Amino acid sequence: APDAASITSSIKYHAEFTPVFSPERFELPKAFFATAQSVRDSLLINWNATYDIYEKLNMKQAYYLSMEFLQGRALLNAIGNLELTGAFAEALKNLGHNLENVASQEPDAALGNGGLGRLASCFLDSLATLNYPAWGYGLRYKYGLFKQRITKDGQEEVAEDWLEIGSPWEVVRNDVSYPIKFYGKVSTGSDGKRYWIGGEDIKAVAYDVPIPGYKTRTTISLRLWSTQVPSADFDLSAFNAGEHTKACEAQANAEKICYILYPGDESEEGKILRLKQQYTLCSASLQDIISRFERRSGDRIKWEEFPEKVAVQMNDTHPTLCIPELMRILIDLKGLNWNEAWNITQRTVAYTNHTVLPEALEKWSYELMQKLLPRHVEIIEAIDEELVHEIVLKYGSMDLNKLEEKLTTMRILENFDLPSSVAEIPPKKVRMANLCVVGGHAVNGVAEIHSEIVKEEVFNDFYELWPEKFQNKTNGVTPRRWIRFCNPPLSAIITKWTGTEDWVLKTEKLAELQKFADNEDLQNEWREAKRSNKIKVVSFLKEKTGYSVVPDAMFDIQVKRIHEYKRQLLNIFGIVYRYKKMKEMTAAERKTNFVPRVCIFGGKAFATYVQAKRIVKFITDVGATINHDPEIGDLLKVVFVPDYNVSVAELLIPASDLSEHISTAGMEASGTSNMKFAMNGCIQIGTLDGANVEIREEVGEENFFLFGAQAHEIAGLRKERADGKFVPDERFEEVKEFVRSGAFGSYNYDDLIGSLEGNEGFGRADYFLVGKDFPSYIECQEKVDEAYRDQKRWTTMSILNTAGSYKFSSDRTIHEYAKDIWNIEAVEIA
Amino acid sequence: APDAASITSSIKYHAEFTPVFSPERFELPKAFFATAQSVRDSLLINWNATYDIYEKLNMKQAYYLSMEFLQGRALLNAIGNLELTGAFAEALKNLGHNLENVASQEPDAALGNGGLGRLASCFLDSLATLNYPAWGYGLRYKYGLFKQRITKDGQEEVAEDWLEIGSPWEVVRNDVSYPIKFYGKVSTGSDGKRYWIGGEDIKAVAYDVPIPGYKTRTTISLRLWSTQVPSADFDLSAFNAGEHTKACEAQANAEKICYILYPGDESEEGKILRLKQQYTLCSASLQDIISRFERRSGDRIKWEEFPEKVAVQMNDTHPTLCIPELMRILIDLKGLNWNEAWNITQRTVAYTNHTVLPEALEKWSYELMQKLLPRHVEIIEAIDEELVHEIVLKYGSMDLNKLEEKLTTMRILENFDLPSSVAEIPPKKVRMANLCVVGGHAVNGVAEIHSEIVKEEVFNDFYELWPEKFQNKTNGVTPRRWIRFCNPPLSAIITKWTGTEDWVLKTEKLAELQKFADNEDLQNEWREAKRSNKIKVVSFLKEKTGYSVVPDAMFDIQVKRIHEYKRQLLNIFGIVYRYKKMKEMTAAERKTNFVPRVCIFGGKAFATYVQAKRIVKFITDVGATINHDPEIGDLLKVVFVPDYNVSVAELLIPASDLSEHISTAGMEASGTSNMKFAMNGCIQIGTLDGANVEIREEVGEENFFLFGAQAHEIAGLRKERADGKFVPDERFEEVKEFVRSGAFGSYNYDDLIGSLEGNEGFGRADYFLVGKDFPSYIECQEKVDEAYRDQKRWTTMSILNTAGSYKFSSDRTIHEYAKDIWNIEAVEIA
Ligand SMILES: OC[C@H]1O[C@H]2O[C@H]3[C@H](O)[C@@H](O)[C@@H](O[C@H]4[C@H](O)[C@@H](O)[C@H](O[C@H]5[C@H](O)[C@@H](O)[C@@H](O[C@H]6[C@H](O)[C@@H](O)[C@@H](O[C@H]7[C@H](O)[C@@H](O)[C@@H](O[C@H]8[C@H](O)[C@@H](O)[C@H](O[C@H]1[C@H](O)[C@H]2O)O[C@@H]8CO)O[C@@H]7CO)O[C@@H]6CO)O[C@@H]5CO)O[C@@H]4CO)O[C@@H]3CO
Ligand SMILES: OC[C@H]1O[C@H]2O[C@H]3[C@H](O)[C@@H](O)[C@@H](O[C@H]4[C@H](O)[C@@H](O)[C@H](O[C@H]5[C@H](O)[C@@H](O)[C@@H](O[C@H]6[C@H](O)[C@@H](O)[C@@H](O[C@H]7[C@H](O)[C@@H](O)[C@@H](O[C@H]8[C@H](O)[C@@H](O)[C@H](O[C@H]1[C@H](O)[C@H]2O)O[C@@H]8CO)O[C@@H]7CO)O[C@@H]6CO)O[C@@H]5CO)O[C@@H]4CO)O[C@@H]3CO
C-alpha cells in the first residue's frame, strides 16, 4: 500500500543505492531515474505475481509478434494504472520537483514508427488491463528509426539517443539467451532427419519491459530481443596485428540487427539485414515460447496440445518466418511428422493484414532467402507443393487455363516450374503474404471495408477455398493513455457527467454524454478544458518551433507520415489559398471572412524520398512568411512540429480543435490517430476512407467534415487526366502561380509543382488528385470556418465526437481477438 | 550495524528488485550478483561519507595514475575489510549457499596484467586502510589482456568475458564525461593564445570502483575511464545505404581505446592506439582532478595552491603526457604564464621507475606524436629548449665535446638540431622517461639497489643536476589480501601466537613469531595450516589441468610472465635432469634420493613470442610424460596451471612450500610475488636479484636458497661465450640430449635447444646463462631436498619467512610515498 511517505523514501533510496549519477544534488535526470526505479519496484512485484500464476495454472497464452512497438513514455501511464499518480506527485513535491517536469525527462522508447507499432502498444495495455494471458515480442532497437530535426533547410535525420544512458524500465534476463543461425547448409543424417549445420551463429538475449494493467495486478511482458555474440568471438590476433575493424567484425555483424528499424534495403546488405531481423524475431520468440510450453508441461509433453496452449499473432507479414521456423523446430528438433507439425502450426499461427493494395505485400528473392535460410526455403517449397496438389484436387483439371491462373495467383513461389503440370529470365520470388494465408488458421483486416477488400480483391481465391479463415478486427486505441492520462481536464469532466470514473474501463459510458451535448454548463467546462490543453501547447511550440501563437484560435492539426498520398500538400495548398485571399483584402474583411487558426503539421519523411522532404521544406517556408507577415498577425500561424512521436501526440491531441485525415480516398486501411482525436473531442475533416467511415458513422455525419472523391470514383478520374480531359479549377492554378511568383521562397519548388502537372509519367500528373479534390476541400474548410463561429454548434460537435468514440477502445478490439482468434480467457491475479 | 538477518533480507531484496536474471530459482550466478549488490550498498554509504568529508575539508589529495590495476575479485576483501565475513557467510547459509562457492562465481576484474598493476591495487588497499585521501585513475578495459587456455598445443589466447554480464561493483557516473581531442591543428588567436581546433572528438565517462579500507570507513575510488561518442555520430545515411561498417566507424574508433590492454604496436595503427590510450588516461584524469580543484576552491581560485592540493603519481612512463597536458590546460585554458604553469606542473607530478636497463624506457616517433597531439609536441619542444639552456648555463661552454655528450643523453628530443649550438637520415624521437625526470619534482625506484641504479646508470646526468629529486620506495603487498583473506588457517595461527589480531594493521608484530620458530606446538599448527591450504589446490589442479596430485609432497611453484629472462627453462631443465636420474635408478633408490614434489608452473606468454610459447608447450609435454609414467607415481608431478591471475595466486601462494624466482641476476627491479610467498611461509629459491636481496636479508640467509652468478659477474660471462671460452657442464648436455632423444615429444624442440647453443647471434648463444647457472641450480635443489627431509628445520625456515616479511607491507610503502613525495595527511571518517 505505497503512500507519499514510502514513495519518497523509495526515490531517495534509489538515488543513493542504485545511482547512475554523481552524489551531488538532485537534478531532473537523477530525479527521473530514481522515480522510474521506484515505479519499477512495484511493476516487478506484480510482474512476478502474474508470471507465477500463469506458470502454475498453465492456461493458453497469446503472443503478439511485431517488428515495431510505439511504447512512448512509460512513467505517467505506469503510475496511472497503478493508481499512484497522487502519491508520486506528492513525493516529488517533497523532494523539490513536480511530476510533469520529471516525466518530461523520460525519452520516448524508440521501438517503433507508426500506427502499426502503436496498435501493438495499445493492445498490450488492453491485454494487461483485461487480465488476458498474453505477451508481446519485439526487437530492442538501439537508435529507433531516426530523430527528426527541422532546420532552415527542412528535415534532417539523426540517430536516437534514448539508450545513451539506458532504460530504467527494462529488465535484462542474462539467462534467457537463444542461438540464431544464418547461412550454412542442410544435410541428411543416417537417422533420416535433416541437420542444418554451419553458417553464422549469434545469440538473442531477452529484455523484459513490464506492461501494467489499469486497476489490476496483471502485469504482462513486452519481451525484446537484443542480438550479440560471446566475448570469445573477438579476434585478438587481428586486433593486436592492427586490424582493429576486422577483429570487431563478428560482433558488429551480430549487433547491427538491432541498430535501427526498417534499415534501407536498396542494397543487398540492407535486404539481408532485414531478413535477419525478421528471422531473429521469429526464431528467438518461438524458441522462448516452446521452452515455456515444455516447462509447465512437466513430465507428460503432448505436442498436440501446443495450439490449445499457444497462440501466435503475426502483426503484418514481418513475422511470416514463424510458419517455416515452427515447422523446422517441430520436425527437426522435436521429431514430429509433417502432418502433425503442419496441423499444430496452422492452429497456432494467425495473420493480420494492414494493406489495401496487393502490391505492397512482401516478396523476397528466392536465391537470397535460400542462401540465408536454406532449411526454411525447403519447408516453404514443401508447403507450396502441398497447396498445388490441394488446388488441383479441389478445382480439378477439366477447365484448365483458368486452373493455371488460380495457381499463378495463389502459389507461394513466383516464377516456379510446378511438380507435374498437365500443361501439354523472370526472377524467382517468395510471396510472404500468401505463406501467411496458408500457414495460419485466421486472416483479419483492421476495418470493416478493409476486411471485405481482403476477401474480395487481394485474397479472393484463398477466400473461395477457406472462407472460414477470414475475419475483421476493427482497430482501437487505449482510453487509458489517450484520454485518462493525456487529458486530465477532460477526464474530470467525463467522471463528473457520467457520475463515475468506471468509464476508463467501461468506455461505452461515454455515450451518456450525448444527452448533455447542448447543456450550457457542460459546454463551458468543455471549452475551458480544451483551452487549458492549448496553453501547454503554446509554450511547446515556442520552444520547439520558435513561433509564438495564441490560444483563442482553431488548432488545425495534420500529424502523420509525410507522403504524397497522405496529401499534406492539399492541406498546405488550402492554407496558401486562404493566405492569398487574405492579403487581397482589408483588415476588417479578413476578420469577417476567416477565423483565427494555428495550423500544425507533424510527421517524418523517408530520408531518400525527395518530394516528401521538399514538402516539409515548403510547409516550413510557408510558415516563415505567414508567421512574420504583420498584416496577418494572429489570424493565421503555420508551424511544423519537429520529431512527431507518442509524447507529441499526447500533447497536441487534447488541444486539437480540427484534425485532418485527407488521404486520397481508398488507400488507407484504418488509421488510429483519428480515433484518438475523436476521443478528445476533436472534429475531423477527412475523405471517406479508412476509419473515417466508421468514426463518421458513430459520431454522426453532422459532426464530421467530409469532402472529395470516393473509392469508387478514383479509377475513372485517373482515366480522366489520362486521355487528357481533366480541367483544373482556377483557384488551384492561382495557388500554383502564387508559389512560382517566389512569394514564400528563394527556394525553387518547380519540381514540387511539377508532380502536379502533365497527364502521364512516374512522379507526375497529380496521381493523388490534389487538384481534383482541391475545390471540395477549400469549400469544406469555409464550412469549418462557419461552424467555428457558432461556438454553441461547434462545442456540441466536439462533445458528440467524444460521446461516439467508445467503440474505438482497444479493449473492444482485444476482447474480439481474444475470443474469436486466440481463444484465451481472462486470468485473475489476486 | 548489518547482521546475518539484515544481510539475508538485503540479498533477497536485490535478487528480486535489482535482477539481472529470470525469477525462477536461486542459482550461483544470481546469488553472487545479489550478494555483491548487498556488499555494494555498504560500500556506497562509506564512499559517500568519505567523498563528503574530502569535499568539505579540502585537504591535499593524491592521484595514482596507472595503465593497469590488477584488482582481482572484490567480494571476500570487501566483506573482509567491512568485517562482515561472518554475517554474509551465515546469510548465504540461510539462502542455501556457502560463501566460497558464491565468491568463485566472481570473475577477476581484467583491468591489469602483472606486478605493475598489482602494485597499484595493493596501494589502493593501503591508501584506504590508512585513511589517506587518494584515488586511483585507470582505463576500464573490456577484454583485459587475454584469457589463457592450455591445450594439447599449449597456450591459446581468448578475449576476457568479465563484463559479458557486467560488473556488480562499478558505479557509472553519466554526468562525469570529459572531451578528449586527437589530431587537428593549432592556431594563434588575436588575443595571442593558442587554440587547438579540429581533429577527432570523443568522450571519456567515469566508472567508480569503491575501494574500502580495513577496519575503517575510508572508502576511496578507483575511477576508470570508458571512451565513447554521442549517438548522433552514428551515420544513418551510410547505414541505410548498406555501408553498415562505415556507419559504425566513429564509435568503433572511439571505443577500441578501452578494448584491450597493451594492444599490439608493431603496426602504425597499434602505436596510434597506444598513444590514444595514454592521452585519454592523462587528459580525462587531469580534467576531473582540475574540476575538483576548482570546486572546493569556491569563489577564490588561487592556482598557486594547486600543488598544495594535488599530487599526481605517474606509475611508469605511461602517464607521461600528464606533464604536457597539465601545461596545456594551465596555459591555454586557465590563462597562466609559462613559468607559473611549469612551477605548478613540477610541484604536482612525480615519477616511478620500474626498469633496470635504459633501453626499455619509452620513446615515440616525433612525426606520429606531433600528428596526434600537435599542441603537446609544441609544449615538449619548449620544455626541451629550456633544458638545453639550463645545461649550457650550469656546465658552461668551456669543455665542449663533453657538453655535447651531456645534451645528447639528457635532451627529451632525439636527433634534433639545437637552438643556437656553438659547435663551429636518423629518425626523430621523443624520450618519455627524460620528460618525466624533467617535469616532475620526484623520481623513485622500487628497491634499494634499483633506486641506486637509477641515479648511477640510467639517469646519471640528471642525478648530477637535481640530486634532491631521486628517492627509493621499496615495493609492498597488502597483508589484508595476501595474508588475512587468502590464508585463514595461517591468520588464525598469527592471531593466536601474537596474542592479538592487530597484526593485520600493525604487521611488524609478525616479528614476534621469531622467538617461537622452534616451538613444536606452533610447528605442528603451521604444518597443518600449510597442508590444509594444499588440499584446496589438489582439487583445483584436478579440474583445471586434469592431473591428480597428492598433498604430502613439496609444492614447488614458479608463477610469472613466461619469458626467457625469467628462466622457466632453467627450472624445467632441473626437473628433467632429476627425472632422468630417477628412471636410471631402482624404486628404493628414488625414494631415498628425491623427496615427493608437485612442480607447478603458471604465467602467460606474449602471443607472438615464438620461444615463450614453445616453452609453455615444453612444460606441458614434460608433465604429460612424467605424470603418466608409472615408475614415477606420486614422486614427481609437473603441472602448468592455466590463466594465472590474482585469484590463482590467492590459491597457490598459501599452499606453496618452495617458490622459484630465478631470473638472470640483475634484470629484475623488485618483484612482489616473492613478498607474498614469504608472507605465507613459503621458502624462496632464487638468484641474488631484485627484491630477493631485501627478502633474503630480512628473513635470514639460512632461510633462503641462493644460487647462480651475480650482477657484477654477468658482463664477464657474456664476454666468455663470446671469444669462445665457455665450457658446458656434462649434466646440462645430458638434459639437452635427453630432449633430442624424443623422450617427451613427437614435438620438435630443436629450435628451443637452438637458443642455448652457439656463441653469437640474436636469439641464440644462451644469452640468459641457463647453462652457466644450471650447475649451481641443481646443486641448490639437492640442498632443498635435504632441508625438506628435516621437517623440524624446514618448518623453522617457513616460520622465519613469515616472521621477516613485515616490512614488505604496502602500508609501509604508502606511508613513505605519503610523507616523502605527495605530502598528504590521514583523514578520519567518523
Ligand atoms: O524519379 C522517380 C523515380 O524514377 C524512376 O525512373 C524511371 C524509370 O527507370 C523508367 O522505367 C520509367 O518508369 C516506368 C516504371 O518502370 C514502371 O513500373 C511504371 O509503371 C506504372 C506502374 O503501374 C506504377 O508505377 C504507376 O505509377 C504510380 C504509382 O503506382 C504510385 O504509387 C505513385 O508513385 C509514388 C510512389 O508510391 C512513392 O513511393 C514515391 O516514390 C518515390 C521513390 O523514391 C521511388 O520509387 C522513385 O524512384 C525514382 C527512380 O529513379 C526510378 O524508379 O521516386 C519516387 C519519387 O516520386 O512517389 C511516387 C510518385 O509518383 O504515382 C505513380 C504515378 O506514375 O504507373 C506507372 C506508369 O507510369 O511506368 C514508368 C513509366 O514512366 O520512368 C521513371 C521516371 O523517370
Ligand atoms: O628471430 C628473432 C628476431 O630476428 C630478427 O631478425 C634478424 C635481424 O633482421 C638482423 O639485423 C640481425 O639482428 C641484429 C640486430 O639488428 C641488432 O640490433 C643486434 O644487436 C645487438 C643488440 O645489442 C641486442 O639485440 C643483443 O641481443 C640480445 C638482446 O639484447 C636480449 O634482450 C635478448 O633478446 C631477447 C629479447 O629481449 C626478447 O624480447 C625476445 O625477442 C623476440 C621478439 O619477438 C623479437 O624482438 C625478435 O624478432 C625477430 C625478428 O625477425 C628480427 O628482429 O624475436 C625474438 C625471439 O627470440 O627474445 C630475444 C632472445 O634473444 O638476447 C639477445 C641475444 O642476441 O645483441 C645484439 C647482437 O647480436 O644484432 C643482431 C645481429 O644478429 O639478426 C636477426 C636474427 O636473424
Numbering used by the authors:
A (entry chain A), B (entry chain A): 23 to 446, 511 to 916
Extract from the study:
The β-CD molecule binds at a totally different location from the glycogen storage binding site in rmGPb. The β-CD binding site (named glucan binding site thereafter) is situated on the surface of the protein molecule approximately 20 Å from the catalytic site. There, the glucose residues of β-CD, G2, G3, and G4 are involved in five hydrogen bonds with the main chain atoms of Gly847, Phe848, and Gly849 and the side chain of Glu650. Furthermore, G2–G6 are involved in 55 van der Waals interactions with stPho1ΔL78 residues. Hence, the strong inhibition displayed by β-CD for stPho1 could be attributed to this.
Starch phosphorylase (EC 2.4.1.1, α-d-glucosyl transferase; SP) catalyzes the reversible conversion of starch and inorganic phosphate into glucose-1-phosphate (Glc-1-P), playing an important role in starch metabolism in plants. The most significant structural difference between the Pho1 and Pho2 forms is a 78-residue-long peptide insertion in the middle of Pho1, termed the L78 segment.
